Amino acid sequence: LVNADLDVKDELMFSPLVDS
Amino acid sequence: THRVINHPYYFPFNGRQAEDYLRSKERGEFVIRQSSRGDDHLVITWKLDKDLFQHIDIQELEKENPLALGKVLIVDNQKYNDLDQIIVEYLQNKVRLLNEMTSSEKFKSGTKKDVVKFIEDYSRVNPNKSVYYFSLNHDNPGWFYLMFKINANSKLYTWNVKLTNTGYFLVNYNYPSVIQLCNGFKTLLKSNSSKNRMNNYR
């Protein structure tokens, strides 16, 4: 159950963070 | 061999029979049974989904005689006084948090394979967006997959989120809700991404 390393320089374009 | 325990959820079952018993019940239902690891252990078997069960070790301390139920019980490295405290404060919260995850719009039902297909498709029709979804790990009861792509042409990454009684464990933090999990996931990726773009020859 290993977490593969983030390896590129691709710009991250995630949806906005959410309040709680 | 057989072991007596005076409790309404205690059954004389091995692991398989506990699963067969639960196969018809609803999510969160469980039994308590004896462990194959000796008279100072018990197991809680509970149902997460169809054909999906988890078996939790209970370690007994402070046993009055070899067969008695320990007066102190350890589940996942946390001390409890009795089986009912385990059900209410450990199990019920683990069920609560499972429902919070499967009710999330970031959660996809189906197999690993089904959800890889959806994320790959959804990555196609939205090529300049970073996409992620959670799904159930059917091969490791108690875990979720966290799958994501940076864009249409990046490879598909799979990370692992462990359900705990107090939140969702990802990398090395236990997030108390799904909303905080998603925010930490994003923040973690931004932190890795910024590092990867550093000049070590400064």
Author numbering:
A (entry chain B): 1479 to 1498
B (entry chain A): 1250 to 1451
What text comes from the article?
Phosphorylation of CTD residues is thought to recruit multiple co-factors, including the essential and conserved transcription factor Spt6, which directly binds to and co-localizes with RNAPII at sites of transcription. The C-terminal region (residues 1250–1440) comprises a tandem SH2 (tSH2) domain that is tethered to the core by a flexible 21-residue helix and contains both of the two known SH2 structural motifs in yeast. The N-terminal module (nSH2) resembles a canonical SH2 domain while the C-terminal module (cSH2) is vestigial and does not conserve the residues that are normally associated with binding to pY-containing peptides that comprise the vast majority of known SH2 domain ligands. We therefore took an unbiased approach to map the tSH2 domain binding site within RNAPII and, contrary to the earlier assumptions, found that Spt6 tSH2 directly binds the flexible, 86 residue Rpb1 linker (residues 1456–1541) that tethers the heptad CTD repeats to the RNAPII core.
To understand how Spt6 tSH2 preferentially recognizes the Rpb1 linker peptide containing pS1493, we determined a crystal structure of Spt6 tSH2 in complex with Rpb11476-1500 pS1493. The crystals contained one complex in the asymmetric unit. Spt6 residues T1250-R1451 and Rpb1 residues L1479-S1498 were visible in the electron density map. The structure shows the peptide draping over the tSH2 domain in an extended conformation that buries 1,194 Å2 of solvent-accessible surface area with both hydrophobic and polar contacts contributing to the interaction. All of the contacts involve the cSH2 module, and are distant from both the vestigial pY-binding site in the cSH2 module and the canonical pY-binding site of the nSH2 module. The pS1493-binding pocket is formed primarily by Spt6 residues K1355, K1435, and Y1381, with the phosphate moiety forming hydrogen bonding interactions with all three of these side chains. K1435 and Y1381 are strictly conserved among Spt6 homologs, which suggests that the binding geometry is conserved throughout eukaryotes. Rpb1 residues L1479 to F1492 lie against the tSH2 domain in an extended conformation to bury a total of 923 Å2 of solvent-accessible surface area and eight hydrogen bonding interactions. In particular, the side chains of F1492, L1490, and L1484 are buried in a deep hydrophobic groove on the surface of Spt6 tSH2. Mutating either one (Spt6K1435A) or both (Spt6K1355A,K1435A) of the primary phosphate contacts in the binding pocket reduced the affinity for Fl-Rpb11476-1511 pS1493 approximately 100-fold (KD 8.3 μM and 25 μM respectively).
